[PDB]
Amino acid sequence: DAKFLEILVCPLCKGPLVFDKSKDELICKGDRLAFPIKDGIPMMLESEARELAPEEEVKLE
Numbered sequence: 001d002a003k004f005l006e007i008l009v010c011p012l013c014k015g016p017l018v019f020d021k022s023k024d025e026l027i028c029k030g031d032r033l034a035f036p037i038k039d040g041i042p043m044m045l046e047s048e049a050r051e052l053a054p055e056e057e058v059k060l061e
């Protein structure tokens, strides 16, 4: 049957993502981008990503 399966890597650099429980987002450290999770579904699309604020880069170090 047709199902939804998607690899969880940054749509740009293909690197791993960090799960942020509080903002329900998947973050790419190397690109400083946060992808949204909508209806429990990670939106792995460059168009959906938001750039991180510098106040946010602080917690990833």
Ligand SMILES: [Zn+2]
Binding pocket: 010, 011, 012, 013, 014, 015, 028, 029, 030, 031
């Ligand atoms: Zn990336």
